Amino acid sequence: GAMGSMERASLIQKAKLAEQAERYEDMAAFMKGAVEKGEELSCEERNLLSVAYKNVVGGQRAAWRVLSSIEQKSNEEGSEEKGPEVREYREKVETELQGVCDTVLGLLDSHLIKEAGDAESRVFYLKMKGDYYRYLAEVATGDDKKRIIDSARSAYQEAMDISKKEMPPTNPIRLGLALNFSVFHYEIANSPEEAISLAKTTFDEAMADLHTLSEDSYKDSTLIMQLLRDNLTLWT
Amino acid sequence: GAMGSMERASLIQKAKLAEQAERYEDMAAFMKGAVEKGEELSCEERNLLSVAYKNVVGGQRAAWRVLSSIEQKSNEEGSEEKGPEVREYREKVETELQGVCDTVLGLLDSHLIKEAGDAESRVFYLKMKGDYYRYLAEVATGDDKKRIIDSARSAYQEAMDISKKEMPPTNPIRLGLALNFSVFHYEIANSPEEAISLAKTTFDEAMADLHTLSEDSYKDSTLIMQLLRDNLTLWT
Amino acid sequence: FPATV
Amino acid sequence: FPATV
Ligand SMILES: CC(=O)c1ccc(OC(C)(C)C(=O)Nc2cccc(-c3csc(C(=N)N)c3)c2)cc1
Ligand SMILES: CC(=O)c1ccc(OC(C)(C)C(=O)Nc2cccc(-c3csc(C(=N)N)c3)c2)cc1
């Protein structure tokens, strides 16, 4: 690792600087270096890791969608042939995206998940594992697409089971996990009814627990509750 | 060059795809590969090259400014020491920015400028040379800062002399060159009066020539004229 | 696209 | 910052 010679604390400091500068590739590289120091991550550090790679893969996904759309049009009836270039460049972006996903999944497997014993860390990492298998699923078309989808499902399911046993229904990690697993159902697993049921049940159970919260916790929970409602409105 | 095995036309096609996907680093790499094929660039190709590197260096400059601001605050009276990390990371971004500028200047010197004989190409490339020396000047602090500033000035001046002899006052390249040389005067050369004089004279001479233009040429020229006015409003 | 976090 | 193109 090119970050092997840098202090852990310096890597975390520079990840925060990179965030302020909107340099998310750098941020991700710094946080990968921090993970590879081998110590567990604090709550703040876990969110630095997720923010960094979410921004990196988010841009890749947006670019892949643009290129896939152009490629699909080039393959409609009546479209002038323009050669292999659209497919090639879509493939280039796709391979880079798969590489980022594999990197994140590698960090989770070596060895963040196995050392995560508290619910807040273990659910967080298993949600990430589901998310990055979901991004692999979005571009998958081969012999292993079903296995990629089931890897996402399995990670989300383990995270869901822990979150329901160990966290209140308003916990923002529990809420965000449910939000994203619901999207997995709708967009990946061809299960819109499951997606809608999960979003609605998560929203209603959170609603009933808001009375227990401080003003600041209320703000955090209702933010994600509104995303659940937004998706329900999109889907119904 | 990693693009040496790709067809020139394929590189241009993929630069356009990268633009649509907002993948400007890729766009720049494709257009560098196209330049290194050794043929002159068409008008469209010149603008693909400039759009690509402008976006790349633009992001670097924005990040450098964020980091320089943080570094300046860390050096105020009363600021807690936090170690070498802010300086180090500012330096990292600065070195990457200088590398991009050197790459662009290298393409202009090998061999775009020497083969550019028409005013539209030669003024375009000399404007670029001034621009990328200006970006080097923005971060320069050493023994060569004056020489970097004079390299920018010299390129802009040669471009200005050609543009005044060979292009109408409404030509958008002539206008954009004047806009940017005016900013050079204001922000780099500590010459706000020269900056203001150049912007105003350029605006007024363009105004007087608009009557000769088609509707579409009028739109192009008045767009940049409005940027001149915007800067004049900022400065007065 | 739908919202994820 | 001022405008450049
Ligand atoms: C589990 C999950 O996927 C999820 C669920 C909810 C959620 O909500 C929002 C508001 C978007 C969030 O980010 N809340 C948050 C919570 C706790 C810590 C931090 C944080 C610490 S450091 C840092 C940084 N950017 N420097 C940010 C942020 C985000 C992600
Ligand atoms: C000289 C100079 O620095 C300058 C001066 C003016 C100026 O004005 C705006 C409107 C911003 C511009 O871009 N005009 C323009 C002109 C001619 C061709 C193209 C073009 C061909 S291809 C392509 C692409 N993006 N695929 C874009 C664009 C930009 C740059």
Side-chain angles (χ1 to χ4, degrees), chain A residues 1-75 78-236, chain B residues 1-75 78-236, chain C, chain D:
Chain A
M3 299 299 181
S5 64
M6 198 175 316
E7 289 278 17
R8 187 185 191 279
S10 301
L11 291 164
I12 296 296
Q13 188 182 347
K14 291 179 183 182
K16 289 174 193 176
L17 291 172
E19 185 179 27
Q20 289 186 78
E22 292 180 66
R23 294 266 300 196
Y24 291 104
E25 299 189 10
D26 288 349
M27 194 196 181
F30 290 140
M31 283 311 309
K32 178 174 187 289
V35 169
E36 292 174 345
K37 300 301 179 183
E39 299 298 344
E40 293 185 33
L41 302 191
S42 69
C43 184
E44 178 175 16
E45 293 161 356
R46 292 195 292 274
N47 283 275
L48 289 166
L49 175 73
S50 63
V51 164
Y53 279 107
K54 175 172 165 76
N55 272 275
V56 169
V57 78
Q60 296 173 315
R61 289 162 75 208
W64 185 93
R65 294 184 180 157
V66 166
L67 297 173
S68 187
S69 171
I70 294 167
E71 185 181 15
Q72 303 216 336
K73 183 59 141 214
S74 85
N75 290 322
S79 295
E80 200 50 56
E81 176 77 25
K82 275 120 167 163
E85 287 86 356
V86 171
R87 176 187 54 76
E88 285 169 356
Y89 185 48
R90 190 266 301 154
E91 269 293 344
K92 177 189 188 164
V93 172
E94 181 175 301
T95 297
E96 282 183 25
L97 184 161
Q98 292 167 325
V100 168
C101 292
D102 290 344
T103 290
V104 173
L105 293 166
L107 297 173
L108 296 169
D109 202 45
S110 302
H111 299 276
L112 290 170
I113 287 170
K114 66 173 58 63
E115 292 307 341
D118 294 354
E120 286 252 337
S121 61
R122 193 168 184 83
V123 173
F124 188 96
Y125 293 135
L126 289 165
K127 178 187 170 290
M128 192 168 326
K129 184 174 178 167
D131 286 337
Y132 283 84
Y133 275 112
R134 172 161 57 87
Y135 307 148
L136 290 175
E138 287 178 335
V139 305
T141 65
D143 277 3
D144 58 355
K145 176 182 163 73
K146 287 175 181 172
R147 268 178 286 267
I148 291 162
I149 288 173
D150 199 63
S151 286
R153 181 207 58 70
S154 180
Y156 283 135
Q157 189 63 60
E158 176 172 0
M160 278 301 321
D161 295 345
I162 297 167
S163 76
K164 295 206 244 203
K165 281 142 217 53
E166 295 303 333
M167 311 166 145
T170 47
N171 182 290
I173 304 163
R174 177 166 169 182
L175 291 174
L177 164 64
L179 181 76
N180 288 17
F181 194 22
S182 167
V183 166
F184 167 85
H185 288 306
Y186 195 94
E187 290 292 335
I188 310 298
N190 197 25
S191 300
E193 290 177 332
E194 186 73 12
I196 289 159
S197 184
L198 177 56
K200 185 183 172 5
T201 290
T202 303
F203 182 97
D204 291 344
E205 274 197 272
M207 182 64 49
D209 189 48
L210 291 172
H211 76 272
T212 66
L213 301 182
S214 73
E215 172 182 317
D216 287 1
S217 292
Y218 182 89
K219 260 39 217 183
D220 294 333
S221 297
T222 57
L223 194 88
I224 305 166
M225 269 168 86
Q226 185 58 52
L227 302 178
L228 289 160
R229 172 69 37 207
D230 289 342
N231 286 354
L232 284 165
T233 295
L234 183 59
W235 294 339
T236 62
Chain B
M3 299 299 181
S5 64
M6 198 175 316
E7 289 278 17
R8 187 185 191 279
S10 301
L11 291 164
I12 296 296
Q13 188 182 347
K14 291 179 183 182
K16 289 174 193 176
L17 291 172
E19 185 179 27
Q20 289 186 78
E22 292 180 66
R23 294 266 300 196
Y24 291 104
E25 299 189 10
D26 288 349
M27 194 196 181
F30 290 140
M31 283 311 309
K32 178 174 187 289
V35 169
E36 292 174 345
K37 300 301 179 183
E39 299 298 344
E40 293 185 33
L41 302 191
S42 69
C43 184
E44 178 175 16
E45 293 161 356
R46 292 195 292 274
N47 283 275
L48 289 166
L49 175 73
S50 63
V51 164
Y53 279 107
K54 175 172 165 76
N55 272 275
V56 169
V57 78
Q60 296 173 315
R61 289 162 75 208
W64 185 93
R65 294 184 180 157
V66 166
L67 297 173
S68 187
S69 171
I70 294 167
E71 185 181 15
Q72 303 216 336
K73 183 59 141 214
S74 85
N75 290 322
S79 295
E80 200 50 56
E81 176 77 25
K82 275 120 167 163
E85 287 86 356
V86 171
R87 176 187 54 76
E88 285 169 356
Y89 185 48
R90 190 266 301 154
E91 269 293 344
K92 177 189 188 164
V93 172
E94 181 175 301
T95 297
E96 282 183 25
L97 184 161
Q98 292 167 325
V100 168
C101 292
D102 290 344
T103 290
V104 173
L105 293 166
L107 297 173
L108 296 169
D109 202 45
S110 302
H111 299 276
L112 290 170
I113 287 170
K114 66 173 58 63
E115 292 307 341
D118 294 354
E120 286 252 337
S121 61
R122 193 168 184 83
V123 173
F124 188 96
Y125 293 135
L126 289 165
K127 178 187 170 290
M128 192 168 326
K129 184 174 178 167
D131 286 337
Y132 283 84
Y133 275 112
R134 172 161 57 87
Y135 307 148
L136 290 175
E138 287 178 335
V139 305
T141 65
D143 277 3
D144 58 355
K145 176 182 163 73
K146 287 175 181 172
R147 268 178 286 267
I148 291 162
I149 288 173
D150 199 63
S151 286
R153 181 207 58 70
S154 180
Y156 283 135
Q157 189 63 60
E158 176 172 0
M160 278 301 321
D161 295 345
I162 297 167
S163 76
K164 295 206 244 203
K165 281 142 217 53
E166 295 303 333
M167 311 166 145
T170 47
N171 182 290
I173 304 163
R174 177 166 169 182
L175 291 174
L177 164 64
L179 181 76
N180 288 17
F181 194 22
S182 167
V183 166
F184 167 85
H185 288 306
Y186 195 94
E187 290 292 335
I188 310 298
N190 197 25
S191 300
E193 290 177 332
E194 186 73 12
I196 289 159
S197 184
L198 177 56
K200 185 183 172 5
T201 290
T202 303
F203 182 97
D204 291 344
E205 274 197 272
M207 182 64 49
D209 189 48
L210 291 172
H211 76 272
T212 66
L213 301 182
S214 73
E215 172 182 317
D216 287 1
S217 292
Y218 182 89
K219 260 39 217 183
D220 294 333
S221 297
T222 57
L223 194 88
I224 305 166
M225 269 168 86
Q226 185 58 52
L227 302 178
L228 289 160
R229 172 69 37 207
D230 289 342
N231 286 354
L232 284 165
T233 295
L234 183 59
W235 294 339
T236 62
Chain C
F1 44 82
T4 55
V5 300
Chain D
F1 44 82
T4 55
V5 300

